[PDB]
Design a protein around this nucleic acid. Structure first.
Ligand SMILES: [Zn+2]
Ligand SMILES: [Zn+2]
Lengths: 49, 287, 56, 98, 214, 10, 217, 116, 56
DNA sequence: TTGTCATTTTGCAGGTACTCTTATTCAATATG
RNA sequence: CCUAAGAGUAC
DNA sequence: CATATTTTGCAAAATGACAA
């Protein structure tokens, strides 16, 4: 007990692509890397206009 | 939902990828391999933000391996063909006595190990006992080789004022500050050589800087506007030597800045590096 | 990590993941596992390039 | 990362004035023998002088940055073992909130 | 005297390796001389002062009947040991003239440390006499007994002709062995001569290769 | 070395 | 090892000591240079017993007043079969009579080696000033050039217990253990000639050395 | 070694042989300042350096939050709380022995056992 | 099941206790360096071996 | 009439396939 | 059409 | 007004002496 700061939330260490992964802490890390690289190739609605 | 943060060049959305680089004005000490004669090298990538924005690399190298006896420390000054011994630099800056030099280098009297490791430097520099002599020595090592003997002093003064540690100052009268900084660099080098601190990690993210759109566009515009103002000066010289009339519109060429910025943003290359500007990916929002 | 004190050589401080994938990894264990996986990926790329050259 | 930002750089003159006001010894008249346990103060990698009471200086710098008088992007590091005080205000530094 | 004991032990090992080398070359050396014990060697070739003598350690060998039948062109051989650590021009000259006047086609010089390059240039004497120099340190351990070293048998000219004829080979199409290889020095190969190599293969029990000296 | 990583040497 | 001494652990230790390279740098705790006006008495009370043994047992008027003192490590002399007499003999042999060397006994509390460069009969009015520098150079070369024991290019030797298949006299192939030495660094030519080992069975990772020592095959 | 400087021109002093008294004499190389010698030692070379392991200790070392705390006995105050850290000598062969600084007395004591 | 998870946790705790004891021995300098490696390398080797056999 | 040993310069190339998009082609002063 | 650059797929 | 030109891994090969 000599802390100077506190993390706002640990899940904020992740990036934009890795924040989509559900339960990323229950996965082997290369799988998380694969999903991070592969969700950019996912198909959806890029813009409303 | 569109977030912005990108340019539209010729109707194409271009984004500037943040370019990573090593931070400037930080002293880093690195060990060297066995075959090399220098064992440890302390270097600083000196640069000034509010000036010419030029990179001048000062290196302080410790010659001789662990088993070697002649462990002389030498500095690589810019525009000098040889590695000048450090004590010569201290005497050139204006610190003649050996005790004052060692005080500027070593901050602990009891640290006799550093003094023992540093004695070869003063032994090497004993031949020069005067500031003017050291300045003449540096000028003689000067790579220009187009200066008379009595003006070599001035040339060395210019080297030690406008080229040696620019990030500290460019004016005169701050010799003591640069001498103190050189002593600090040698102190760090000797601490690393004495196995008191590990060599600096090049991968430490706190030693890295990310150039965003701001600094990148700033340096590109600095180069481009320097080109434009040189063109303005050339036009003024041409129109005054030919005694023609002077006009502002005929002087300025906005095409220079416009085309330069548009070319740097339209193509990946950043000049006149590659892939600095990339087509914004619009396959998905997260992309 | 800045979440440990200086000179901590405990298994948790230097990358021992005592949790299974079923239980889930703590943030520090998650980061250490990420470092291990990054090493694996880099090794894979280097190995495939080097093996191609050697095979040729 | 989601909450990571990059500093845009600020002018270090106000911080240098604060340091001089609060008791930073100028480097020109610094004699190491008379001040052995002096903390060297660096601003953007430029050794500006030494301070004899680094604890109070760091405390007041933290207070000023925590009330907004110093720009929050400015990073201040106190290395006790090395007896150094580094202040960085240049652009390109990546930070996160805590 | 421990240094003297180790020196005489190394000299005895070198003598054993030299005798083995000469016997392998096809000359008549009885098995008893090869297996000579340390005490007998110390009694014969070492004085009462404990310093071994090399002048009476040098010897002469002659080809055996089988070698003469197979190689009817090679005669007596001379092996010499030098006493002084460094061999000068005068001693090498005496050795080579002694070789020449005794009609030896081969003479092995065994030196202690080194040969002066001024004596190396005069090592090639008038043919067919050949001079081979060996360092005692290199002759302490017989390399041919190492399990990695397979069996080497020099081929006669008729055997080499038959080998080239049966396999339709030219001189250059055989595998090469350098004329500086330790086994080639051990057997005294000359350029153009082919050694048959007997090896214990693991796919077949026995495998015979051939290497031509270059 | 190599190249890369001539020789050495040449 | 030799087949008759394959399992003999102390013989394996003997061979390990015999081949492993040892330098003074791995043994000397520290080195110093002192100014003793006479080579008959010392100003250090600790090592006065050494001089009052050596001088009493035993010329000295041609010895430089400068002295080089080496303090060794007890642990270094313990883990390796090295003693004060051995290192003193090595120094005396490698420096001939040019350096007068004395050493404390092994049972003494501190391992001390005292060296003085002998003075040639020719008088010099300038070599006296640089005598200290000369002694420094001698200390430098004494740290690395000379070898206490072992052959060169042998950084470190370790001993392992392997288990090979040996045909039993009754006929079967039984598991028989042996002591085997693994050496960092390759000096195949010099190691192979060391007595007590099996010269036939020596092997090396560096097949270049095998080729240039044993042969192309 | 404890090197000393000339008090006339602030320069180094080198050892020098003497004949009249056969004594070590420290001399200046530029102003001929000459004086006696405090100790016969003129050069020390630490092959195994023991000092520097406790380096970096400062009168307010307890203010560092990253330094771990401990309740080990302080054999000058008998206080529990103190800070501890391993050897500061960055050689690869140094031992993992710990050092403790009491925050009420600033006395450094080790966890070694051969020394004790 | 529950008993197996409890036994696994007990095994991990026992291995961590052994690592802590080795750390106490090393920090008291009572640990002896394996021939061919330094003190720190021997300590790291022991810790890694204990953790690996714990996981196994 | 022969070895010796000890600094200063010497060349470089990085796996196999495959898909897509974007930009750019010397600017400008000068003579016919 | 050429060239260059960037992004990406399977190893 | 339009075309023309101004990061990485070393063992040697070579050099300057040289010493009588
Ligand atoms: Zn003086
Ligand atoms: Zn206390």
């Amino acid at each position: 007990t000599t802390f100077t700061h506190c993390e706002i939330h640990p899940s904020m260490i992740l990036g934009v692509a890795a924040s989509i992964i559900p339960f990323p802490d229950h996965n082997q890390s290369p799988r998380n890397t694969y999903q991070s690289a592969m969700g950019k190739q996912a198909m959806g609605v890029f813009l409303t206009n | 939902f569109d977030m912005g943060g990108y340019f539209i060049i010729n109707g194409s959305e271009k984004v500037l990828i943040a370019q990573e680089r090593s931070a400037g004005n930080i002293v880093q000490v690195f060990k060297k391999a066995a075959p090399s004669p220098i064992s440890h090298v302390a270097e600083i990538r000196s640069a000034l933000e509010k000036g010419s924005r030029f990179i001048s690399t000062l290196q302080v190298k410790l010659y001789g391996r662990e088993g070697s006896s002649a462990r002389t420390i030498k500095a690589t000054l810019p525009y000098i063909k040889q590695d000048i011994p450090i004590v010569i630099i201290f005497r050139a800056l204006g610190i003649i006595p050996d005790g004052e030099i060692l005080e500027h280098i070593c901050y602990d009297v009891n640290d006799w190990q550093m003094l023992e490791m540093l004695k070869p430097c003063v032994e090497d520099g004993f031949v020069i006992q005067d500031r003017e002599t050291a300045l003449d020595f540096i000028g003689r090592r000067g790579t220009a080789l187009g200066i008379k003997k009595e003006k070599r002093i001035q040339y060395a003064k210019d080297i030690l004022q406008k080229e040696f540690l620019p990030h500290i100052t460019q004016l005169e009268g701050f010799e003591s500050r640069k001498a103190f900084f050189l002593g600090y660099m040698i102190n760090r080098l000797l601490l690393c050589a004495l196995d008191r601190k590990d060599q600096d990690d090049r991968d430490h993210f706190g030693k890295k800087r990310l150039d965003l759109a701001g600094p990148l566009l700033a340096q590109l515009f600095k180069t481009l506007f320097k080109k434009l103002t040189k063109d303005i000066f050339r036009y003024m010289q041409r129109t005054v030597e030919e005694a023609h009339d002077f006009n502002m519109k005929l002087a300025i060429n906005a095409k220079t800045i416009t085309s330069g910025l548009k070319y740097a943003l339209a193509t990946g290359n950043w000049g006149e590096r590659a892939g600095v500007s990339q087509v914004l990916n619009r396959y998905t929002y997260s992309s | 990590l800045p979440h440990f004190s200086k000179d901590d050589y405990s298994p948790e401080s230097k990358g021992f993941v005592e949790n299974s994938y079923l239980r889930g990894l703590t943030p520090q264990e998650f980061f250490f596992h990420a470092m291990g996986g990054r090493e694996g990926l880099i090794d894979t790329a280097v190995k495939t390039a080097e093996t191609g050259y050697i095979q040729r | 990362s989601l909450m990571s930002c990059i500093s845009v750089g600020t002018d270090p003159m106000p911080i240098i004035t604060f340091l001089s006001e609060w008791g930073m010894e100028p480097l020109e008249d610094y004699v190491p023998h008379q001040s052995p346990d002096a903390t060297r103060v660096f601003v953007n990698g430029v050794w500006h002088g030494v301070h004899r009471n680094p604890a109070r200086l760091m405390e007041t710098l933290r207070t000023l940055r925590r009330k907004g008088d110093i720009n929050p992007e400015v990073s201040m590091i106190r290395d006790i073992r090395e007896k150094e005080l580094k202040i960085f205000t240049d652009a390109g530094r990546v930070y996160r909130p805590l | 005297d421990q240094e003297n004991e180790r020196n005489i032990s190394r000299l005895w090992r070198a003598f054993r390796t030299v005798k083995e080398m000469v016997k392998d070359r096809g000359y008549f050396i009885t098995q008893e001389e090869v297996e000579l014990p340390l005490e007998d060697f110390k009694a014969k070739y070492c004085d009462s002062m404990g310093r071994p003598q090399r002048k009476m350690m040098s010897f002469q060998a002659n080809p055996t009947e089988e070698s003469i039948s197979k190689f009817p062109d090679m005669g007596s051989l001379w092996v010499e040991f030098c006493d002084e650590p460094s061999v000068g021009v005068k001693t090498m000259k005496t050795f080579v003239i002694h070789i020449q006047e005794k009609n030896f086609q081969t003479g092995i010089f065994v030196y202690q440390n080194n040969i002066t390059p001024s004596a190396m240039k005069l090592v090639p004497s008038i043919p067919p006499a050949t001079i081979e120099t060996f360092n005692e340190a290199a002759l302490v351990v017989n390399i041919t007994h190492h399990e990695l070293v397979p069996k080497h048998i020099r081929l006669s000219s008729d055997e080499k002709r038959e080998l080239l004829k049966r396999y339709r080979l030219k001189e250059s199409q055989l595998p090469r062995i350098q004329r500086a290889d330790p086994v080639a020095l051990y057997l005294g190969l000359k350029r153009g001569e082919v050694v048959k190599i007997i090896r214990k293969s693991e796919t077949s029990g026995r495998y015979a290769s051939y290497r031509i000296c270059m | 070395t190599x190249p890369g990583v001539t020789x050495p040497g040449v | 090892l030799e087949p008759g001494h394959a399992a003999d652990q102390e013989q394996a230790k003997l061979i390990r000591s015999a081949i492993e390279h040892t330098t003074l740098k791995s043994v000397t705790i520290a080195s110093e240079i002192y100014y003793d006006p006479d080579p008959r008495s010392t100003v250090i009370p600790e090592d006065e017993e050494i001089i009052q043994l050596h001088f009493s047992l035993l010329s000295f008027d041609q010895q430089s007043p400068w002295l080089l003192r080496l303090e060794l490590d007890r642990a270094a002399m313990n883990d390796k079969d090295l003693t004060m007499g051995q290192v003193g003999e090595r120094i005396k042999q490698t420096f001939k009579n040019d350096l007068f060397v004395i050493w404390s006994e092994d049972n003494d509390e501190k391992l001390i080696i005292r060296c003085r460069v002998v003075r040639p009969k020719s008088l010099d009015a300038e070599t006296e000033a640089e005598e200290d520098h000369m002694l420094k150079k001698i200390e430098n070369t004494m740290l690395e050039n000379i070898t206490l024991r072992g052959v060169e290019n042998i950084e470190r030797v370790v001993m392992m217990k392997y288990d090979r298949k040996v045909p039993s006299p009754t006929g079967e192939y039984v598991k028989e253990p042996e002591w085997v030495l693994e050496t960092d660094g390759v000096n195949l030519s010099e190691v192979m000639t060391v007595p007590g080992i099996d010269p036939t069975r020596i092997y090396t990772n560096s097949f270049i050395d095998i080729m240039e020592v044993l042969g192309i095959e | 070694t404890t090197f000393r400087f000339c008090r006339d021109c602030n320069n180094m002093l080198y050892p020098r042989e003497d004949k009249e008294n056969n004594r070590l004499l420290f001399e200046c190389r530029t102003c001929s300042y000459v004086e006696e010698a405090g100790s016969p030692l003129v050069y020390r070379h630490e092959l195994i350096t023991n000092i520097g392991e406790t380096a970096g200790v400062v009168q307010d070392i307890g203010s560092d939050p990253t330094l771990p705390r401990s309740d080990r006995e302080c054999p000058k105050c008998h206080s529990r709380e103190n800070v501890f850290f391993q050897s500061q000598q960055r050689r690869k062969d140094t031992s993992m022995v710990l050092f403790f600084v009491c925050l009420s007395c600033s006395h450094i004591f080790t966890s070694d056992q051969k020394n004790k | 099941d529950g008993p197996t998870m409890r036994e696994i946790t007990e095994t991990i705790a026992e291995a961590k206790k052994k690592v802590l004891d080795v750390t106490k021995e090393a920090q008291a300098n009572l640990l002896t360096a394996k021939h061919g490696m330094t003190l720190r390398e021997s300590f790291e080797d022991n810790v890694v071996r204990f953790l690996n056999e714990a996981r196994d």
